[PDB]
Amino acid sequence: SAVKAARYGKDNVRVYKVHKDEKTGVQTVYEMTVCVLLEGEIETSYTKADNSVIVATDSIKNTIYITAKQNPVTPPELFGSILGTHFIEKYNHIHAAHVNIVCHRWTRMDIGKPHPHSFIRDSEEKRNVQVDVVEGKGIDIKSSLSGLTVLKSTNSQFWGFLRDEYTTLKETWDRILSTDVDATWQWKNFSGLQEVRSHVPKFDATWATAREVTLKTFAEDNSASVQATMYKMAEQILARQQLIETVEYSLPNKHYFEIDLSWHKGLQNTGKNAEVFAPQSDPNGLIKCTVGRS
Amino acid sequence: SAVKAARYGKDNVRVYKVHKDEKTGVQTVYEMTVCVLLEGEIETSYTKADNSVIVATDSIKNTIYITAKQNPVTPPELFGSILGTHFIEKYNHIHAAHVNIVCHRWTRMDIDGKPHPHSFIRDSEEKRNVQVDVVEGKGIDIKSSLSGLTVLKSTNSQFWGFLRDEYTTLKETWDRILSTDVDATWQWKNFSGLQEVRSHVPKFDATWATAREVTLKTFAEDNSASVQATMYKMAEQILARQQLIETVEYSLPNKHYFEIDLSWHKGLQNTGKNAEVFAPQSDPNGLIKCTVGRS
Amino acid sequence: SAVKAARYGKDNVRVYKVHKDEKTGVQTVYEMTVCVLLEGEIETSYTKADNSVIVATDSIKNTIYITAKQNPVTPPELFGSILGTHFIEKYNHIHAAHVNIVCHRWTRMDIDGKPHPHSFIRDSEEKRNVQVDVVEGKGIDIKSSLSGLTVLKSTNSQFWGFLRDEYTTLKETWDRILSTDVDATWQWKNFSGLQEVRSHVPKFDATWATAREVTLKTFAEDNSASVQATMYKMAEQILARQQLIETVEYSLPNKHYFEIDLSWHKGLQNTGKNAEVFAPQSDPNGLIKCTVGRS
Amino acid sequence: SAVKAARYGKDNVRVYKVHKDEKTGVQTVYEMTVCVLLEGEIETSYTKADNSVIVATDSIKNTIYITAKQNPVTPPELFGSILGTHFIEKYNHIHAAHVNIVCHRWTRMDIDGKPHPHSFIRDSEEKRNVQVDVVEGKGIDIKSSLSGLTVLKSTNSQFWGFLRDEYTTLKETWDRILSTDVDATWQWKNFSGLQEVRSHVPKFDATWATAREVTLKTFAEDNSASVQATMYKMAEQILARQQLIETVEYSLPNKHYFEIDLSWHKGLQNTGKNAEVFAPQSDPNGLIKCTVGRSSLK
Ligand SMILES: Nc1[nH]c(=O)[nH]c(=O)c1N
Ligand SMILES: Nc1[nH]c(=O)[nH]c(=O)c1N
Numbered sequence A: 001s002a003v004k005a006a007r008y009g010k011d012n013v014r015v016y017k018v019h020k021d022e023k024t025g026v027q028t029v030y031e032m033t034v035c036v037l038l039e040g041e042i043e044t045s046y047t048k049a050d051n052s053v054i055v056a057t058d059s060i061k062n063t064i065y066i067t068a069k070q071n072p073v074t075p076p077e078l079f080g081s082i083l084g085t086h087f088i089e090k091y092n093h094i095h096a097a098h099v100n101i102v103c104h105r106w107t108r109m110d111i112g113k114p115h116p117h118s119f120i121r122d123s124e125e126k127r128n129v130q131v132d133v134v135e136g137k138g139i140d141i142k143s144s145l146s147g148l149t150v151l152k153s154t155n156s157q158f159w160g161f162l163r164d165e166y167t168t169l170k171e172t173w174d175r176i177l178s179t180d181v182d183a184t185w186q187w188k189n190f191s192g193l194q195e196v197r198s199h200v201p202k203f204d205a206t207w208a209t210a211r212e213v214t215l216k217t218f219a220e221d222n223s224a225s226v227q228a229t230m231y232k233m234a235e236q237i238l239a240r241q242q243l244i245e246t247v248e249y250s251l252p253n254k255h256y257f258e259i260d261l262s263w264h265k266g267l268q269n270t271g272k273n274a275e276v277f278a279p280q281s282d283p284n285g286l287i288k289c290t291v292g293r294s
Numbered sequence B, C: 001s002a003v004k005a006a007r008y009g010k011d012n013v014r015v016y017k018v019h020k021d022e023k024t025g026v027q028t029v030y031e032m033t034v035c036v037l038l039e040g041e042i043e044t045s046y047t048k049a050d051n052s053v054i055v056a057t058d059s060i061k062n063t064i065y066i067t068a069k070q071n072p073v074t075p076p077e078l079f080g081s082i083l084g085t086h087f088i089e090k091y092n093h094i095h096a097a098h099v100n101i102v103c104h105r106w107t108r109m110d111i112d113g114k115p116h117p118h119s120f121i122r123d124s125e126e127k128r129n130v131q132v133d134v135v136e137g138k139g140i141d142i143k144s145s146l147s148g149l150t151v152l153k154s155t156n157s158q159f160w161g162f163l164r165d166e167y168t169t170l171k172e173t174w175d176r177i178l179s180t181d182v183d184a185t186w187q188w189k190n191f192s193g194l195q196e197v198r199s200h201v202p203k204f205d206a207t208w209a210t211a212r213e214v215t216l217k218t219f220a221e222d223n224s225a226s227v228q229a230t231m232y233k234m235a236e237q238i239l240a241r242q243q244l245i246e247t248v249e250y251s252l253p254n255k256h257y258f259e260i261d262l263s264w265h266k267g268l269q270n271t272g273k274n275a276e277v278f279a280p281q282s283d284p285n286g287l288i289k290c291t292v293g294r295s
Numbered sequence D: 001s002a003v004k005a006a007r008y009g010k011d012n013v014r015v016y017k018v019h020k021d022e023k024t025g026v027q028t029v030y031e032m033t034v035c036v037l038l039e040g041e042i043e044t045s046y047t048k049a050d051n052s053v054i055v056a057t058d059s060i061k062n063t064i065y066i067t068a069k070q071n072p073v074t075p076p077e078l079f080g081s082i083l084g085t086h087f088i089e090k091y092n093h094i095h096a097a098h099v100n101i102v103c104h105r106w107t108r109m110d111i112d113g114k115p116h117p118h119s120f121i122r123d124s125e126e127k128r129n130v131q132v133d134v135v136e137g138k139g140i141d142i143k144s145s146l147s148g149l150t151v152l153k154s155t156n157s158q159f160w161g162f163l164r165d166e167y168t169t170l171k172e173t174w175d176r177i178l179s180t181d182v183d184a185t186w187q188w189k190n191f192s193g194l195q196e197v198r199s200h201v202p203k204f205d206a207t208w209a210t211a212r213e214v215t216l217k218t219f220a221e222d223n224s225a226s227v228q229a230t231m232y233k234m235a236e237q238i239l240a241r242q243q244l245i246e247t248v249e250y251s252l253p254n255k256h257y258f259e260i261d262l263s264w265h266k267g268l269q270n271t272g273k274n275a276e277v278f279a280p281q282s283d284p285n286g287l288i289k290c291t292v293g294r295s296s297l298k
């Protein structure tokens, strides 16, 4: 037998960093969870028990802290870039670095005044980046939002789908639509650290756009197909930023079922009279697509 | 042997109710998870396998749905009271209903600065709960709370002056991160029946609001050297601002962030005045509780 | 306002300890998560920012490690008693320690049916736990328990003859699935202090063993139409077997499996007698409780 | 724009089946969570809102129950294959089904040393999984695996002779605790259709059993200096005992147990050789992965 693939690294490294502005007094905090896996001339640690080729997982840990110490940590795309580039450069036998970064929200609180040093976790929503640094191939970056959960109580439908002897579902012209939204936009390959730094302002700006399109489309679109809603979201993101190659959406649906109460004193709670529903934990629809340029 | 205590019922009954406005076309959503437990003359179901005194747990579920259909689901203090009352009035063997409610956030989305008539975002894992205890001839006990509210402040928190002995290694410190989850409970004065409850309805949302605000505002502003110290200030003001509350309870996990000493690597400065990069700890955590009532 | 109640301490302290038999070669491990909350004359920390009455939570943490180093960690009833006793003995102003311990399974691996000297598998999420209360001048209260035990039986369960009103829709049934997680608590007669506890050491493991075995066996054998009656049987036998227990407490969150009607499809038969494929429901679920003591 | 990829379907379908043998009266339970995703000529639901090409996700759910009703659910490699094959046959516009199946453990209880005919216990959170890709005329790819297997050995594990530089603080060590979750994936050689899959049915359970047991035994016996070295021994053995496996994949998170220096307190003795009490860490953790295949040498 033979190694067809190997990577190893450190997962779940929690990192906090603060930025104290001494002029205005204002503090700013950043919290993230970091995952780094390395590939390279390491066959022999598997085949031959040879550890000399292994940069220890504990040292990878140190490097993360050291790197955050000395470099910006925002936007995550730049940090993940610096961090990965370091590994392919400090070590001759390491030729690929995969860096994963989960950004946790710490929004500054309003006491109508922004407070200079106090934050609240105002949502379990995350902002993430996967950055792959391969020797001679530059830097690929997938950027994403996830954990964004929404509901609209009307202006969705579902009718006209395939009907056979497996179908029981009734068609509907007014229904609840709810979903978690996970959205990944993929950047054009960058050639190295360099080209990445010249693009820094685009990253935050693109996140904000991606979030805002998602929110506003989901809210204003009145469709009978979640598919079509997702596609319109992707289009505008593509339209709005030249450097993005692909947009990818994954929406896990949350069903809310009607509850027939007519067995009880003829209470009317279906159709136009539906007021009380039963949120279902499972099962759940799951819809994806990846959308690119023509 | 003999049965000292017995309770049974339905847990985790997910409920959603929509409100549609007529004129305006604005919709409002409410979603909760409801738990209802019954007490009463039910011993023989344990001792003699007698099911004739069991209201089926499936029926408790239908009851929840139906009560929610014919009644306001908000404030949940009301709704709990209506639902616990129904039990003791419909059944002579049932003498106590215990109703737990967890309300989940569905905030209305802001779209280009306008508020959207029918879309919402789950904008925090934070919850608003009530526990309502309806006991035959003791009226209605209500515990209101907020939990899951997670905060950090990067400075203006200290910790010195604690006892030291041959178990201590903590250094003292005049600047540290302070992050916690906030669990806060306010107990209302006993109420006599649904009647009295109906009549204090607007005090309910108002006091939740007040509670959130005092917690938030006190946590930002207090430059304190004691989590105990800050909590107590929070409780005091809530007692001060609402006559009908008898006790305030705070439970605060105190989630630690460690300084990472980076000096062994090219003498790098990351502690004291210089600390910029820290390791949040998943565990262990400090836990500080108290109940504060009037004198 | 006054402080009605207050405690503080260290939650989620994970602790591992290994025992090496330098004779046999045989190693044995223990891993638990520990929580220690102190009570005492500590008002002033809350009222007047005074920390000189605060034994830092950090030092509570150090103390767990230190005690675990010098004492047996098994049975956890012992160690919790030793641990809470240290606190009220060494601090004048501390009058109560509450110690909680969750023990995680590391069962010895069988490699070619030989027990292995040093490898273990987490063979279940089931926990063994203690709650230990050490109050000054009141001695030691210990609640021992098992939780996270999940079982299922595919037949020999019925449910019929419960109460039927205009809230009821549930069909009565003579063969159904019964599944539940089992949370079971046995409460020891008050001990007077560390000595009394020690002289009872071997009763602890033995009792946990019996509670488990009684639980499984009664659940498997009992062909009942009432979950209540099954729980009660379990509790009698636990009391009959161990004099020193005062009460036994059972919390049964039970999980539903619904029939799936498939007759709309080619008249396929999947209900009552013909039921084979079922849909397990994540929620809601029934929840049944009791405390049984001696009359 | 253009749809470059699209899949839609039903995730988290919980399913239980009971098999009653009325000879003996023994009953056997299966429970699993099922995910089915469809691909094929469905672009237009996205670009033009056309629902006429969508099999409604509620219908995918019905189909899972009905198939479980009319077929065996075990081994999950067969069930998945049946289940996926059905979607490519019933619909022309569907060209691929991806089926994911998590199986949950219900082990028979022993009461007084005898198996009970009809009670079971969730004896572990360990799962047995299949991923089954059923694509038009490329037949049936099947990744099988186990996950949720948590193990610890408290000595006979070492770590020394690793690269040292100005990022390193780790002490070399010759006795330490090794714990991990084991996640392990065997990839089967492509099968040409259902037919081929039924005629390998007995090999499914046996390979899961071997895979598990090889994992257990190697983990316990190896005195390694390398988690890598140890994962590689496991994969080699699996590959040697089943021909129809092409690749083995291992993914091992290592959970750390730190030493606690207690020497500042009454000179207390708790590191290297007298270490008895440790601080298990929730995070961070090492993650070692590898795919192991067959050699091309002779
Ligand atoms: N700590 C540790 N242990 C291993 O077996 N392998 C590794 O790579 C590291 N870093
Ligand atoms: N299914 C079930 N089982 C019980 O033991 N008690 C109950 O009330 C119900 N509804």
Ligand SMILES: Nc1[nH]c(=O)[nH]c(=O)c1N
Pocket: B159, B225, B226, B227, B228, B254, B286, B288, C008, C054, C055, C056, C057, C058
């Ligand atoms: N470490 C710490 N921090 C607090 O705010 N309060 C406390 O009581 C302790 N022990």
Ligand SMILES: Nc1[nH]c(=O)[nH]c(=O)c1N
Pocket: A158, A225, A226, A285, D008, D054, D055, D056, D057, D058, D059
């Ligand atoms: N049942 C359902 N609901 C949707 O919104 N979209 C879909 O595609 C299906 N199949």
